[PDB]
Amino acid sequence: MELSFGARAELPRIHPVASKLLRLMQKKETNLCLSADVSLARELLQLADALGPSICMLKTHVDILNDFTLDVMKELITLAKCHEFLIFEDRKFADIGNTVKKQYEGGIFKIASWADLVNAHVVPGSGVVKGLQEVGLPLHRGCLLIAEMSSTGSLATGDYTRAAVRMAEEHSEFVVGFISGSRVSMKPEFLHLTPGVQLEAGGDNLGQQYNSPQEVIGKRGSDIIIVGRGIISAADRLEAAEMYRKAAWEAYLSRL
Amino acid sequence: LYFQSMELSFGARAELPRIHPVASKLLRLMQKKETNLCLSADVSLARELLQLADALGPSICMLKTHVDILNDFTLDVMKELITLAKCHEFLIFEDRKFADIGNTVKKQYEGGIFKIASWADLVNAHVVPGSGVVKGLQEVGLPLHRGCLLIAEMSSTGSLATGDYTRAAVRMAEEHSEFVVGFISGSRVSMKPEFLHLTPGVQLEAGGDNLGQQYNSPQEVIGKRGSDIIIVGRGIISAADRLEAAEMYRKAAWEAYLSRLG
Ligand SMILES: O=c1ccn([C@@H]2O[C@H](COP(=O)(O)O)[C@@H](O)[C@H]2O)c(=O)[nH]1
Numbered sequence: 001m002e003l004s005f006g007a008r009a010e011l012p013r014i015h016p017v018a019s020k021l022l023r024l025m026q027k028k029e030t031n032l033c034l035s036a037d038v039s040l041a042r043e044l045l046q047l048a049d050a051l052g053p054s055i056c057m058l059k060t061h062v063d064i065l066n067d068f069t070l071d072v073m074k075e076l077i078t079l080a081k082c083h084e085f086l087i088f089e090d091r092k093f094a095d096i097g098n099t100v101k102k103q104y105e106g107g108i109f110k111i112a113s114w115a116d117l118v119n120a121h122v123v124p125g126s127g128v129v130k131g132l133q134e135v136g137l138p139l140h141r142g143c144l145l146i147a148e149m150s151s152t153g154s155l156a157t158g159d160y161t162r163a164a165v166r167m168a169e170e171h172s173e174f175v176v177g178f179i180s181g182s183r184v185s186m187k188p189e190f191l192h193l194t195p196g197v198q199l200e201a202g203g204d205n206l207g208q209q210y211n212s213p214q215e216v217i218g219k220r221g222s223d224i225i226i227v228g229r230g231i232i233s234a235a236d237r238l239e240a241a242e243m244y245r246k247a248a249w250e251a252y253l254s255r256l
Numbered sequence: 257l258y259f260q261s262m263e264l265s266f267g268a269r270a271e272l273p274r275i276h277p278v279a280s281k282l283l284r285l286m287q288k289k290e291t292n293l294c295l296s297a298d299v300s301l302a303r304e305l306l307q308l309a310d311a312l313g314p315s316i317c318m319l320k321t322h323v324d325i326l327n328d329f330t331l332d333v334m335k336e337l338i339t340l341a342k343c344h345e346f347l348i349f350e351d352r353k354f355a356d357i358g359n360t361v362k363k364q365y366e367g368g369i370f371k372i373a374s375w376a377d378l379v380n381a382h383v384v385p386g387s388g389v390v391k392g393l394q395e396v397g398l399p400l401h402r403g404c405l406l407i408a409e410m411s412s413t414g415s416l417a418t419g420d421y422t423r424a425a426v427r428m429a430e431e432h433s434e435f436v437v438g439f440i441s442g443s444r445v446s447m448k449p450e451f452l453h454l455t456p457g458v459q460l461e462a463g464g465d466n467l468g469q470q471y472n473s474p475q476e477v478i479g480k481r482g483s484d485i486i487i488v489g490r491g492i493i494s495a496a497d498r499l500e501a502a503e504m505y506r507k508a509a510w511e512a513y514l515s516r517l518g
Pocket residue numbers: 035037061090148149150151179195196197208226227228229230356357360
């Protein structure tokens with residue numbers, strides 16, 4: 001039968017980052033990842049503080065922050081420790097191994113110094129994971145591979161998706177799961193995170209497609225919903241966050 | 257591969273009725289300077305980037321940046337780079353590999369600390385998200401008269417940018433030809449002469465690195481496979497004499513181009 005998050009956290013071959021996430025998910029009754037898609041540091045830290053108790057994870061796009069500094073990220077880490085959530089930088093590493101290693105460790109962002117989780121596209125081959133691993137393994141980090149995408153015309157389907165899964169299984173010391181629209185692996189130690197979620201189905205003007213928490217967690221078997229605009233554009237952001245949390249959590253309970 | 261006869265020169269392609277103005281500018285610079293070399297300036301310090309640009313600018317048609325590895329990035333460094341690009345006549349290509357939904361990539365191109373759209377002549381995108389990635393970029397880039405390259409093939413071992421994926425890249429380019437000016441690819445992927453083909457994974461001798469990079473010669477990628485421009489990083493920037501390395505790559509790539517004419 002379907003394992004609970006608490007059970008999965010204790011699997012022999014589970015990743016320590018994966019274990020930590022699943023424990024705080026069970027403990028807090030949230031499988032909600034906030035997509036903190038804002039342009040100001042103050043807004044990012046405000047969201048993290050106000051919605052931290054409602055989320056298992058906060059997803060960042062630091063390259064969209066007009067006033068990024070490393071001190072902003074240290075402050076985010078303080079909030080993540082206080083409220084108990086993981087920080088996931090949605091960087092979509094997608095280059096040869098030698099390049100991505102530098103993009104993950106260095107530059108002005110120093111991503112590996114603050115992100116628990118990053119993600120990678122599998123299009124370059126497994127060298128992308130090999131490069132990131134050289135930096136992330138010593139720092140006890142995790143990685144998610146992009147197996148499916150939520151946008152219209154996505155090419156992350158069929159054999160491409162299957163390749164994502166194979167790559168993830170061959171690098172289980174570093175890769176802890178997937179960005180996907182559905183359960184793509186049958187190994188329960190892998191996490192499935194799903195963007196393209198709003199309470200009601202719909203989309204945007206630029207190819208985003210939305211499905212309900214019930215659809216993606218209940219019917220499609222994913223673990224975590226990633227929600228941006230459904231929360232951050234709402235008149236009341238905490239109310240929105242709690243609505244998504246309840247919807248996603250009840251849909252998970254329904255699978256048990 | 258089969259190529260039709262009477263191969264067009266870069267100058268001739270610059271005159272085609274449906275050529276993109278950025279492609280036309282690049283093609284004329286290539287013809288004028290006898291270079292189809294793009295330098296991949298994969299350095300950590302702004303000093304190094306600008307010294308490369310100044311010393312190697314006359315040998316190159318294009319400089320490819322990864323500004324997210326630049327430890328001391330500022331917009332002032334980009335202003336200095338643009339002046340060198342004007343003084344030595346080359347385009348600036350930020351190898352950002354935009355690869356997210358349209359709503360997100362629009363902000364990544366225009367915003368944040370890098371403000372990429374304000375300085376890069378060219379950017380590139382992966383086509384995995386569907387055409388929304390190009391539509392989002394285009395909303396920022398077309399008002400600014402910029403161009404875009406789509407990643408149709410990759411140089412690395414295990415690349416999934418093959419077959420139907422490559423074909424989808426070409427179709428997406430055609431659907432957005434007011435903005436997309438060509439491809440990152442290992443070979444000619446479209447017979448349409450208005451499209452540029454840029455090929456990374458190039459060294460004077462075939463080879464590779466320890467993290468999945470594969471190298472082919474300029475003769476192989478330009479002369480045999482029909483690509484237009486070679487993108488070279490370590491082959492030049494890891495050498496003791498970089499100007500000599502750059503000239504060697506320029507000569508090899510240019511002679512290979514000449515070999516396909518008339
Ligand atoms: O396949 C994917 C992968 C990542 N994202 C990201 O997830 C968030 C979705 O936000 P929203 O559409 O809920 O505002 C955005 O940051 C977007 O970049 C997707 O939407 N779809």
